[PDB]
Design a protein around this ligand. Structure first.
Ligand SMILES: Cc1c(C(F)(F)F)nc2ccc(CCc3nc(N4CCCC4)nn3C)nn12
Ligand SMILES: [Mg+2]
Ligand SMILES: [Zn+2]
Length: 313
């Protein structure tokens, strides 16, 4: 009850900034996450015994893949922590509780393969869920871990509050299917610009939280250049493995996933920043002005890839 978590001074300070890296010591990520729940939600949101037990069960169910791993989960949760703290009065007691959990859980049991690879391989999960295949698997794994004895971190919530919070986590986790983002951003664009955007319309919050989820999920482009550059290695290491698997089933993989097309990486990073990240963080800054630093940071990294193309590094 009176048991704070505290972080070394550098982490206590740097953790409040959007571009914070959680570092290479796996063993402190749980402490960091708790620390964020406590400052973000209150020391009373969750029973410490149950939360710790849930954190460690979630960790166990992420896999040793290059990118979509436990470090991605806590990274995505920290970006969300930063958004919540720079917009504190805008979000319900329940939304604060659910969204940090949604980010931790959003890639549960990822195998390092896209929805398309499950479909082309004919993986059972593609039969169970026709669209947002892995994302419905992710929500599913969240509910599994929430039902393990001693893991109900929501046990204090009323019947209806519990259903509302699980429904926030469901839509939150679905929204991380980037195929849905393009349409989600476009509507939020129109709504903002015609002045029809209304945060009391629950279907408008849903979209806004959706965009926040894309923003957190992509936050690896909003870090200091050396962190962004090195993460891209992990991202490409999964995609090229999926490329190899595609060739195994007798399919030319899209160039993104062809390791033979290593050389066009900086050109592909440009496309991605221009077609995906820049728009994401633009619309998000318009809707939530204190998130501007994600946009500024994203721009800087775009500029760093331009420098790579021109052989300035
Ligand atoms: C940095 C990053 C993130 C995140 F935000 F999460 F960090 N999420 C993604 C998703 C895709 C990509 C690769 C972009 C791309 N590469 C290519 N290739 C063609 C031939 C060689 C390169 N085409 N495209 C579109 N990066 N990425
Ligand atoms: Mg995902
Ligand atoms: Zn993710």
């Amino acid at each position: 009850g009176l048991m704070q978590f505290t972080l070394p001074v550098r982490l206590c300070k740097e953790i409040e900034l959007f571009h914070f890296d959680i570092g290479p010591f796996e063993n402190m990520w749980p402490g960091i996450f708790v620390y964020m729940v406590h400052r973000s939600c209150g020391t009373s949101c969750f029973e410490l015994e149950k939360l710790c037990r849930f954190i460690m069960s979630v960790k166990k169910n992420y896999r040793r893949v290059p990118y979509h791993n436990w470090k991605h989960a806590v990274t995505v949760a920290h970006c969300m922590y930063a958004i919540l703290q720079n917009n504190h009065t805008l979000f319900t007691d329940l939304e604060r509780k659910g969204l940090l959990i949604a980010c931790l859980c959003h890639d549960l049991d990822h195998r390092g393969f896209s929805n398309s690879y499950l479909q082309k391989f004919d993986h059972p999960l593609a039969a169970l869920y026709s669209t947002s295949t892995m994302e419905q698997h992710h929500f599913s794994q969240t509910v599994s871990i929430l039902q393990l004895e001693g893991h109900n971190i929501f046990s204090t919530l009323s019947s209806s509050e519990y259903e509302q919070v699980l429904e926030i986590i469901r839509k939150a986790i679905i929204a991380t299917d980037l195929a849905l983002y393009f349409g989600n951003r476009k509507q939020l664009e129109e709504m903002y610009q015609t002045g029809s955007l209304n945060l009391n319309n629950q279907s408008h919050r849903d979209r806004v939280i959706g965009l926040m989820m894309t923003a957190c999920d992509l936050c690896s482009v909003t870090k200091l250049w050396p962190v962004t550059k090195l993460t891209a290695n992990d991202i490409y290491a999964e995609f090229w493995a999926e490329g190899d698997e595609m060739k195994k089933l007798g399919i030319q993989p899209i160039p993104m996933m062809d390791r033979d097309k290593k050389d066009e990486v900086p050109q592909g990073q440009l496309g991605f920043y221009n077609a995906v990240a820049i728009p994401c963080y633009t619309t998000l800054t318009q809707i939530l002005p204190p998130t501007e630093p994600l946009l500024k940071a994203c721009r800087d990294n775009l500029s760093q890839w331009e420098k790579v193309i021109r052989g300035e590094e």
